[PDB]
Amino acid sequence: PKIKTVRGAAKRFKKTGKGGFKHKHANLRHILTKKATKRKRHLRPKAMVSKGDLGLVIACLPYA
Amino acid sequence: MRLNTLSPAEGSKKAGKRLGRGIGSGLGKTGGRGHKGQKSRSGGGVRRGFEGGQMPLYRRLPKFGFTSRKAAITAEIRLSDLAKVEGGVVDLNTLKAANIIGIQIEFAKVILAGEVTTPVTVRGLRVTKGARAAIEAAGGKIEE
Amino acid sequence: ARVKRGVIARARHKKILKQAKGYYGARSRVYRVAFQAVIKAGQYAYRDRRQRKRQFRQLWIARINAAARQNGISYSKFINGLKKASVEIDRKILADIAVFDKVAFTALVEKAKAALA
Amino acid sequence: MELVLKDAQSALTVSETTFGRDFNEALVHQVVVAYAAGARQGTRAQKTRAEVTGSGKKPWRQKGTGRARSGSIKSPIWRSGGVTFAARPQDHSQKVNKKMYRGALKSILSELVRQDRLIVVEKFSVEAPKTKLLAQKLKDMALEDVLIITGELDENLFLAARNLHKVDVRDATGIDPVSLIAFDKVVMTADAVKQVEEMLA
RNA sequence: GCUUGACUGCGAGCGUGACGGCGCGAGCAGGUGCGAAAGCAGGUCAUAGUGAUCCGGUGGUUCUGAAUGGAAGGGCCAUC
RNA sequence: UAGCGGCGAGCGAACGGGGAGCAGCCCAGAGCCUGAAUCAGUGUGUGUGUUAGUGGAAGCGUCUGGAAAGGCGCGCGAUACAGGGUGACAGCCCCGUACACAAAAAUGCACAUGCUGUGAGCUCGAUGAGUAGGGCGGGACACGUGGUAUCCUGUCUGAAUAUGGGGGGACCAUCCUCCAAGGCUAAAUACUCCUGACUGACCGAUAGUGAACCAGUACCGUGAGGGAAAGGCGAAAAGAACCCCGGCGAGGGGAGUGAAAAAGAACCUGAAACCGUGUACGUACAAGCAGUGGGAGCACGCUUAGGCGUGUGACUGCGUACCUUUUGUAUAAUGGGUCAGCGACUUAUAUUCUGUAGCAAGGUUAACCGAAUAGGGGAGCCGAAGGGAAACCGAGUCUUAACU
């Protein structure tokens, strides 16, 4: 049968033009008052999945 | 050319691995699985994304965004597609008739990709700044 | 495509049992035991192609020593003497001469002694 | 590209694309193998340990008997047990890309021409459905093992050919890659050559 | 003494991590404080004072809005 | 995919598109004209099938052999060279096969034509209430109560009824669309205890059914239930008259049959473990994985008369099996009494990468149609554009009031 997407992964990663994946940074959901504006500002843009983790993401998203 | 003088191309037919057929094969005994543990077992191995119990990457990162229903009914047309319609009048129905866009597409944009050389009239479609200049340079026109 | 193994299995077992001819008891009769015996015979044969070269040189040396000492010189001085005389005759041949041509061996000893003189 | 006739004395003209291309052995091989795979029926099965007739009772207790542990009388280790990877009916057919099929046929036909195995004729007919007549016609033409391709498949020639095992008679629509290779000679009517010309072009 | 730079948007480059992350940062834009001025200031001599994701709450933002206009709900930003 | 989801594991649509197949009607009611229609039922024609059957071509000589269908030579049939049998492999010996025919009787079907009931059509009405909806509890919907539409209803309630009502995914307005609470309806779809025919890169007696055989038997169990083993003389029984030893035995030796009896029924082939008889050599002062390297002697062959070969192996150097598991095993750790047979990385569908082939800014079709491995079918799918959560913009885009 067709492989099933890991649906939680599909909600967290989007494939980019050269076949990497963008994700949102962790640590910007709550407990924000104590965090420096600089730290939070750098967490706001999307980031690319690292080399070590790409295998895990690709396994989860066969139809990306 | 006989049924007993045909050969496959060199490199086209690699023999499959056969595990567990003795020492000389190089895949005897353990069959490439190493010694013991979950991965050596029949049916053995952990599920996709499992990292040993550490919160996995697809759960320690946050969800983001929503899915647009409008994006699914919006297409992009290349300049190369404009010559492929019948009659040199590009609109949503003529693009559908030429199999350029799907039946359920409601909105389409012409972008600067490929080349237009024939003169064409684009009707009821959005056109990029660059596509507009290319269509008009090729003698065409864009009707809003 | 069911494949029966009997013809090939028989030929393989018979090949091993033929190489185990002369071995004692189960070693010439029983495949499981004969197989181990044939492997070990092969391991020893490999080792002993090296050992054969050691054992023969040891034998030649012992005989040269006996013959040299009958002519009033030790092996170690005899060999040194031959090397100083530029005689390149090897130990297989010297030991052969020591047994089969004692006058020629004596001539080699006198050559060795002259080079040491 | 010219092909000459036999019963009429002419030089018919055909395409270099169809009847003059180089022999692509790898392509032809793939299509011939696919054709043989498509002939397979794939009808068989064995019984897994689930399907062998017998009870699910554990043959003897897990511990204490001094025997190897047993779970099922149907174990594939056991005489009368299941087949470990019991066969099921299979579909052995392969996909052949349409262009690869047509490319293979062009290679085959071009090679038949190069090897002087394609014989073009104006007409090939028999007066009656009599095997003796066709046998006489073929020995006249110095043919024994031959594929005969006609425009319209007539009853008389089809019936005359049936009991000659070395002879087969097709219409141009019924050509297949294996039969073009398998027969020693291929006889084509001028009509059939046109139809194969149009089919491949 | 005077003050709100414990600023907002960004950030060359670098450190440290398997990763998630964490850290240092001149400089650029806007607006600000102190100083006559050069200047200094994006918290505190530095290194501890912390908790991913989910689910939900509050404010902002017509980004989305299942016939259409709205709305609900969702997104995005801030925050709990 | 959209969604659902301790937003975990997992679950998973629809809209819309391409196909197969297509078929629409009746009551909730009178009247008018009439019973015409179409379905059934029950009769008889009419073909056409089924359940027995009939005919069905063409070969001889010679060689080998127990036997010819084989070899060799020369003929003949073929709308028949499917297949099976016959003393080895047969188009022409036999049974068939292609093809052409056949039914007293029963019966299926398709027509046509009698007959019983069913009653067409047309104006004029009518239009399913403890129901829809609601509250509570559950269930069903991909949808876990969620912002949750829609469906079902155990419980308590309860409309409007065409100027009316349902739905369009909370809800409202507008617009669109449909008409619940009565019912019938072929085809395309599912399956095979069973019957016929045909097929297989399916098995070939530990396989294939549990069962090739008097097997769901023997046997086991109070019972439900469990559940085997076990095929082959030969072409033909010509299955061994008769004689001899023996207990009027068993068993054997002759004779005879046969191509063969070491095919003799304990029967094709007849492996291995295992057990014997015979011969050569070794072995009764000698210590251990039993071999290996060296090696005398003896016996028997042999083509220089030479050594050479084969068997044996006194004496001597070296030398603690195999598997597994381990840091590490002669290990006194595991496993194996031996042999023979069987016994473990497969299959399907998705997906990615490599190789290879085709075509190439294109590539490829699925179901299905087609007698078609052809051909048709481009519905789709992947690719030629990305950025952004998204609207949206687009070789850019996002970020930000704006970017060095």
Ligand SMILES: [K+]
């Ligand atoms: K491996």
Ligand SMILES: [K+]
């Ligand atoms: K034929």
Ligand SMILES: [K+]
């Ligand atoms: K500043």
Ligand SMILES: [K+]
């Ligand atoms: K003959």
Ligand SMILES: [K+]
């Ligand atoms: K026959």
Ligand SMILES: [K+]
């Ligand atoms: K109710």
Ligand SMILES: [K+]
């Ligand atoms: K309405």
Ligand SMILES: [K+]
């Ligand atoms: K059974």
Ligand SMILES: [K+]
């Ligand atoms: K059985």
Ligand SMILES: [K+]
């Ligand atoms: K020894």
Ligand SMILES: [K+]
């Ligand atoms: K251990």
Ligand SMILES: [K+]
């Ligand atoms: K133990």
Ligand SMILES: [K+]
């Ligand atoms: K693959």
Ligand SMILES: [K+]
């Ligand atoms: K490929």
Ligand SMILES: [K+]
């Ligand atoms: K940029």
Ligand SMILES: [Mg+2]
């Ligand atoms: Mg937030």
